[PDB]
Amino acid sequence: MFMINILMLIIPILLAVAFLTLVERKVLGYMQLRKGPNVVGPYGLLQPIADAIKLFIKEPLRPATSSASMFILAPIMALGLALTMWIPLPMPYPLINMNLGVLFMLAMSSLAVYSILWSGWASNSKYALIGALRAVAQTISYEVTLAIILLSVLLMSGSFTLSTLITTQEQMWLILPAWPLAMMWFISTLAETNRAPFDLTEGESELVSGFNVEYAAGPFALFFMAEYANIIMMNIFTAILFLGTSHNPHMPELYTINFTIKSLLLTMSFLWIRASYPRFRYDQLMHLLWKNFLPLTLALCMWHVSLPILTSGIPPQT
Amino acid sequence: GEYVVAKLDDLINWARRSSLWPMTFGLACCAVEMMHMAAPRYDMDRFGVVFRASPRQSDVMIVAGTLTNKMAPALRKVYDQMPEPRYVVSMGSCANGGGYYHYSYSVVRGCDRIVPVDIYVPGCPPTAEALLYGILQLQKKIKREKRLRIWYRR
Amino acid sequence: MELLQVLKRGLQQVSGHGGLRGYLRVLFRANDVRVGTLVGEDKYGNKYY
Amino acid sequence: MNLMLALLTNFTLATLLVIIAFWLPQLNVYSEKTSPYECGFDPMGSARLPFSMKFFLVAITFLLFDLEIALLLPLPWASQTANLNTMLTMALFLIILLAVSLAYEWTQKGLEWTE
Amino acid sequence: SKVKQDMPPVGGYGPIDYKRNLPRRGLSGYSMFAVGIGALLFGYW
Amino acid sequence: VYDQVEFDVPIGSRGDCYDRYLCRVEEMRQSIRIISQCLNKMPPGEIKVDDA
Amino acid sequence: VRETFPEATIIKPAEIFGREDRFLNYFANIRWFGGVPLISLGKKTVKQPVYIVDVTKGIINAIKDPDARGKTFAFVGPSRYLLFDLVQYVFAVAHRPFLPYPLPHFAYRWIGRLFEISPFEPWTTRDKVERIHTTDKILPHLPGLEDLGVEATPLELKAIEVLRRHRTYRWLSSEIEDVQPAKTIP
Amino acid sequence: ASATRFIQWLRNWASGRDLQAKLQLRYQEISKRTQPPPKLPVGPSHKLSNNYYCTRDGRREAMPPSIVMSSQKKAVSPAPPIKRWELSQDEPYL
Amino acid sequence: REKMFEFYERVSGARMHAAYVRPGGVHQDLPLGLMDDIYEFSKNFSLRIDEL
Amino acid sequence: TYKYVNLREPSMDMKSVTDRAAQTLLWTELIRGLGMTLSYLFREPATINYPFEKGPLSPRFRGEHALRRYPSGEERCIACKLCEAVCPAQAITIEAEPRADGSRRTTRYDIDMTKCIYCGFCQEACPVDAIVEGPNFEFSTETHEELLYNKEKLLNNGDKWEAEIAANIQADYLYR
Ligand SMILES: CCCCCCCCCCCCCCCCCC(=O)OC[C@H](COP(=O)([O-])OCC[N+](C)(C)C)OC(=O)CCCCCCCCCCCCCCCCC
Ligand SMILES: CCCCCCCCCCCCCCCCCC(=O)OC[C@H](COP(=O)(O)OCCN)OC(=O)CCCCCCCCCCCCCCCCC
Ligand SMILES: CCCCCCCCCCCCO[C@@H]1O[C@H](CO)[C@@H](O[C@H]2O[C@H](CO)[C@@H](O)[C@H](O)[C@H]2O)[C@H](O)[C@H]1O
Ligand SMILES: CCCCCCCCCCCCO[C@@H]1O[C@H](CO)[C@@H](O[C@H]2O[C@H](CO)[C@@H](O)[C@H](O)[C@H]2O)[C@H](O)[C@H]1O
Ligand code: SF4
Ligand code: SF4
Ligand code: SF4
């Protein structure tokens, strides 16, 4: 009954990712005064299936100069780690209930970076290498700010357990006492997922396709699936972190409905932002985080350390 | 036997023609009408046609403009770097047969001296709608492929 | 309410195409379900609206 | 066990997809197809040549800042101590020294990329 | 018959806008900042 | 007939990409301004030199 | 074909090597299985492979040559090699580790029968095993490529053209001179 | 043009304009696709008299260049200095 | 741009390479009702610049 | 006259300064940009439903070529070769001779449609309205050779499209 539970998690994720690509193409279409897919299936509903089948019957390529083992390893890590990020999510019950779910996701997200570094490096081509080193730059920009932003929020929750964030937000969303952190967190998730305006490791208009320019067919699809699975997961995490849904233990489906709507809307906002802004220069991303978010995050970290003590609002360990 | 491979062709053909990704590759004037096919009035994306810059992630090459001798080795290169199956659409008189520079010392008299061409779209330039007619004609060519039926009868 | 009047034009489209079967035929053949005035028909069976 | 089962399934599914991707499609491999990509013209030199890092000084500072989080991450637990007078002083002390280190590198142009 | 060719209407055409029009919107900085701190205090409470 | 239409020439002050972007956008506005004059002042008559 | 069309030119090529051949490519692909199995260690078979362009030019010259009618030609390369020397040279030009080991004739039809089960293009067959280990015939009574104006191309000039794609990145840029020619049978 | 009042309100508020007055989709304000025939005017040279071509021949009044100097007093410039442009009174500062 | 291509096509029959302006004038006169449509387009264009 | 696109010094009163600090910190001008694309999301898209809906064209449209006839069915082309002389692309090739009845008619009339620039000069030069560019633009082919038209192809195009060609010429000949 646990293996069935695992399949009830990852198969829907791959279906949600498939239809997220359709929803992105439609939403950007209408914001761009056009329609987007509406021929392949009614309202384009069969488009993701056609794209999936086409890629997996397309010829994969191993570049002559590439490092074979790392070339193939890199897409497997990308999808493997993207799905691993979902096992601790309380929806409202996690598949795996971790004491330190917040830190587990931080560690896995750091490991998922290497699927970019090694794919770009193993490709042994210049555009792939340039994209890979942008990933190094991008991680340096957001990782320090991201962890300290989380720490400030967890000082009101009192735990690293993701399920405790549900209990913390039983009377009120944490976005009220921490909207300055929610703002910087929301930006950090765009940088963390290589999403526009921080889509730099791929950066179509500068690097052709960046770190995965040499990938084709199925191996390319794994990277694309991993990206969109990370988009949804990070918006679920944002919803749990700042827009806590009340949980009724006798009607857990009602949590899952309200919780899903919030995550969809947050994911829709990622598409909305992509349609609205130009791309950052990747040294301007580093300065944004280090010169703006970091000084403010450090100050808010001290503030949220002190605030529970001075207001006598320290949460419990459980 | 025949019935299963017959349906399987219909499936792989349907997927390939419903998900056609042209290389982001334009040469001259005709690339402007290629832009207008991506623009709202015609919205190529609604047919499942999506530009992708990398040759590795492209199914179709639309040769949109004049091919010079200096450019010819580069065009052949990115064509060779597409994974298969791959298709070439020749757009406009210059690509089709040299056109108005046909007698120039620096122009390739038709891109079909360099790559195989599936569809020839006439015009100088073809209207955006005429190119869309060519793309849909390429789709109907792919709908008629018999890869598995022929394999089964080998 | 407007939202109800919008939803009544969706059902007039279904009947305007001759029932659910006719509505689905145009939806899958043409990816459109608008109902327009029949202007004419040619000798090959094409219908113009 | 459950966690190990979950990790194995995730990376087992990913590997199966790669295997299918490599053995299902019809392949036609030749030298020009697999040559390195660079916009239609042959690459000029090796992609293994050194690639200068302009943000090298920020990259080292990240290593030192990236260890501040390990020292600060225990703070939610430390807030449960009886000795809150000592806590808050030491927690604020660490963050301020981290802020001071950032200010020093900032004012001394350590965050500017080299040209 | 009199000459007929594409011409403007006898009175001419109506005015055509061209100048930049980016209207002003929103609240003062004070009001926006005040709303935010009001939100924070209720959140802390 | 450019001596018979009124329009302004946009001018930058920093010689950078942003100023050239603003010059081009303001040039589009001045094009509409000229087009309004051409529409109103279109004269009658032949369209090519009466010299066969 | 001889009785049906008495005036037909019949061409009898040795194994042909070229970019898309099933000869040099065939040996180079055996690396995927570790060692290179050979009947009698490849010390019993002699081959005289001929270049694809030589065969093509010979065919084209037969069309135009009025004296090629009713004749039979043997298109063979310029040098005869022991199979073991040939396959060892294939691995040197590809820069892949060569681990030959003998495999008896009966056991190496069993492997050939196992590969025949693919409904696709077999990787190898029993008949393929027989042909590869068949000694190339010496037929002096038949006119050759030289009688059609074609000068046979040595395997050494064109091996790199075919086998470069089989190298790893470390060895892709080795020149034609870096590998000494295989020993020939005089 | 078919958008409901609520949606008209919503996209007006979001954009900050009155989008309905200046829709980017054309309806029936455009010219009819069937027009009456024109009757185009003729040029100045459509006269029956006093119209000899040799009095209106531009190509034949072109002359070879004037040789100023051939190798076979105050200083001058090519033309008067250009006047300095004046600022617009329509909108001097964008 | 698509609607301005229609003006090119209406005067010359081609959306882009009109070949319309020639030494001596233009090839053909403006078709009846074109100047009305150009005015209709120009009435709204500045708003499009504003959105940009 | 001229105007300055970027030469304005911002005011330094605490209200204006505080307004800009709110803009920097509350992202108000980036939020405002989100409003614009939101407004477009609720606008009717401009996409037409091709091939069931077509883009608008005019009677002057320059499309596929066709050779025309008189009402009797006689060809209008008299092998004057004015179209062949004016063709900027040298896309026209003509041969002629006296017909069996003595008529001046072509025995070859080729248009290399991959040389042609669809410029319409040929139909301007023709003194009898023989060669025209019809309204068809949907004739893409699967082979290059299919775009090398000979007289039989062009005459068939004339018979195929004459109903529309005549109506377009009727609507525009008074501008010529
Ligand atoms: C999110 C995940 C999505 C995954 C989607 C996966 C695709 C689902 C749809 C599958 C439909 C069948 C696809 C067949 C496409 C085959 C490619 C092709 O067209 O080649 C033409 C070839 C025909 O080639 P041919 O023989 O005619 O000639 C080839 C030689 N030249 C190039 C000279 C012509 O088809 C085949 O060879 C066999 C067809 C097999 C169809 C059934 C599939 C079995 C394949 C098993 C392979 C063995 C390894 C096991 C791999 C694992 C399999 C799960
Ligand atoms: C009682 C005592 C209380 C004590 C605590 C009081 C604290 C209240 C005041 C705190 C300040 C509030 C603002 C905090 C958010 C961070 C503000 C910020 O960092 O903005 C500056 C940053 C850089 O802007 P820039 O002008 O280029 O740099 C300065 C020029 N040298 O600007 C940027 O970040 C640019 C971002 C570009 C990318 C934006 C793309 C997304 C935009 C739409 C998202 C809208 C917000 C969504 C929020 C979602 C929340 C779930
Ligand atoms: C360059 C080096 C920079 C070093 C900067 C260090 C800054 C440290 C500032 C002082 C921080 C703590 O400040 C101190 O906190 C404790 C609360 O924990 C307060 O103490 C108060 O609460 C505690 C418990 O919470 C009670 O036991 C006590 O009766 C009461 O006085 C002190 O009144 C306050 O002075
Ligand atoms: C306790 C946590 C919160 C406290 C804040 C801690 C971080 C403080 C960061 C340093 C602030 C002072 O140090 C910083 O030095 C540089 C000198 O290069 C100053 O000046 C520089 O900054 C800005 C941005 O880089 C440039 O536009 C300017 O041209 C340059 O002169 C900054 O205006 C000043 O902010
Ligand atoms: S075919 Fe015509 S429009 Fe296209 S590139 Fe050539 S000249 Fe330009
Ligand atoms: S349209 Fe122009 S290029 Fe084409 S045949 Fe006529 S004159 Fe020649
Ligand atoms: S088509 Fe017209 S211009 Fe050309 S040869 Fe015939 S009559 Fe003369």
UniProtKB/Swiss-Prot annotation, chain A:
Gene Ontology MF annotations: NADH dehydrogenase (ubiquinone) activity
Pfam family, one: NADHdh
GO CC annotation terms, alphabetical: mitochondrial inner membrane; respiratory chain complex I
Keywords of the record: Electron transport, Formylation, Membrane, Mitochondrion, Mitochondrion inner membrane, NAD, Respiratory chain, Translocase, Transmembrane, Transmembrane helix, Transport, Ubiquinone
The keyword Membrane belongs to this UniProt entry's keyword annotation: yes
Binding partners and assembly: Core subunit of respiratory chain NADH dehydrogenase (Complex I) which is composed of 45 different subunits.
Function: Core subunit of the mitochondrial membrane respiratory chain NADH dehydrogenase (Complex I) which catalyzes electron transfer from NADH through the respiratory chain, using ubiquinone as an electron acceptor. Essential for the catalytic activity of complex I. Essential for the assembly of complex I.
Chain positions found as N-formylmethionine: 1
Membrane-spanning intervals of the chain: 2-22, 70-90, 100-120, 146-166, 172-192, 222-242, 253-273, 294-314
Keyword Cytoplasm in annotation: no
A biological-process GO annotation: mitochondrial respiratory chain complex I assembly
Protein name: NADH-ubiquinone oxidoreductase chain 1
Subcellular location: Mitochondrion inner membrane
EC number(s) from the headed UniProt entry: 7.1.1.2
Reactions catalysed: a ubiquinone + NADH + 5 H(+)(in) = a ubiquinol + NAD(+) + 4 H(+)(out)
Membership in a protein family: Belongs to the complex I subunit 1 family.
The organism's place on the tree of life at top rank: Eukaryota
Bilayer topology annotation: Multi-pass membrane protein
Curated annotation (Swiss-Prot), chain B:
Post-translational modification: Hydroxylated ar Arg-52 by NDUFAF5 early in the pathway of assembly of complex I, before the formation of the juncture between peripheral and membrane arms.
Catalytic activity, reaction form: a ubiquinone + NADH + 5 H(+)(in) = a ubiquinol + NAD(+) + 4 H(+)(out)
Modified residues (Hydroxyarginine): 52
Cofactor requirement: [4Fe-4S] cluster
E.C. number: 7.1.1.2
The UniProt record lists the keyword Metal-binding: yes
Bound cofactor: record note: Binds 1 [4Fe-4S] cluster.
Lipid bilayer topology: Peripheral membrane protein
GO biological process: aerobic respiration; electron transport coupled proton transport; mitochondrial electron transport, NADH to ubiquinone; mitochondrial respiratory chain complex I assembly
Record's subcellular location: Mitochondrion inner membrane
GO cellular component: mitochondrial inner membrane; respiratory chain complex I
Gene Ontology molecular function: 4 iron, 4 sulfur cluster binding; metal ion binding; NADH dehydrogenase (ubiquinone) activity; quinone binding
Annotated positions binding [4Fe-4S] cluster: 29-30, 94, 124
Sorted UniProt keywords: 4Fe-4S, Electron transport, Hydroxylation, Iron, Iron-sulfur, Membrane, Metal-binding, Mitochondrion, Mitochondrion inner membrane, NAD, Oxidoreductase, Respiratory chain, Transit peptide, Translocase, Transport, Ubiquinone
The protein's role, per its UniProt record: Core subunit of the mitochondrial membrane respiratory chain NADH dehydrogenase (Complex I) which catalyzes electron transfer from NADH through the respiratory chain, using ubiquinone as an electron acceptor. Essential for the catalytic activity of complex I.
The family this protein is said to belong to: Belongs to the complex I 20 kDa subunit family.
Swiss-Prot record, chain G:
Cell compartments where the protein resides: Mitochondrion matrix
Principal location: mitochondrion
Keywords recorded for this protein, A-Z: Acetylation, Electron transport, FAD, Flavoprotein, Mitochondrion, Respiratory chain, Transit peptide, Transport
Modification note: Acetylated on lysine residues. BLOC1S1 is required for acetylation.
An individual GO BP term: circadian rhythm
Listed GO CC annotations: mitochondrial inner membrane; mitochondrial matrix; mitochondrion; respiratory chain complex I
UniProt-recorded Gene Ontology molecular function terms: NADH dehydrogenase activity; protein-containing complex binding
SS bond partners: none
Subunit structure: Complex I is composed of 45 different subunits. This a component of the hydrophobic protein fraction. Interacts with BLOC1S1. Interacts with SLC2A4. Interacts with CLOCK. Interacts with RAB5IF.
Entry's family note: Belongs to the complex I NDUFA9 subunit family.
Its job: Accessory subunit of the mitochondrial membrane respiratory chain NADH dehydrogenase (Complex I), that is believed not to be involved in catalysis. Complex I functions in the transfer of electrons from NADH to the respiratory chain. The immediate electron acceptor for the enzyme is believed to be ubiquinone.
Protein known as: NADH dehydrogenase [ubiquinone] 1 alpha subcomplex subunit 9, mitochondrial
Gene name, Swiss-Prot/TrEMBL: NDUFA9
Full-protein residues shown: 191 to 376 of 380
UniProtKB/Swiss-Prot annotation, chain H:
Membrane topology: Peripheral membrane protein
Membrane-spanning intervals of the chain: none
A Pfam cross-reference name: CI-B14_5a
Principal subcellular localisation of the protein: mitochondrion
Any GO BP annotation: mitochondrial electron transport, NADH to ubiquinone
Quaternary state and interactors: Complex I is composed of 45 different subunits.
Family affiliation: Belongs to the complex I NDUFA7 subunit family.
UniProt function note: Accessory subunit of the mitochondrial membrane respiratory chain NADH dehydrogenase (Complex I), that is believed not to be involved in catalysis. Complex I functions in the transfer of electrons from NADH to the respiratory chain. The immediate electron acceptor for the enzyme is believed to be ubiquinone.
Name recorded for this polypeptide: NADH dehydrogenase [ubiquinone] 1 alpha subcomplex subunit 7
Gene coding for it: NDUFA7
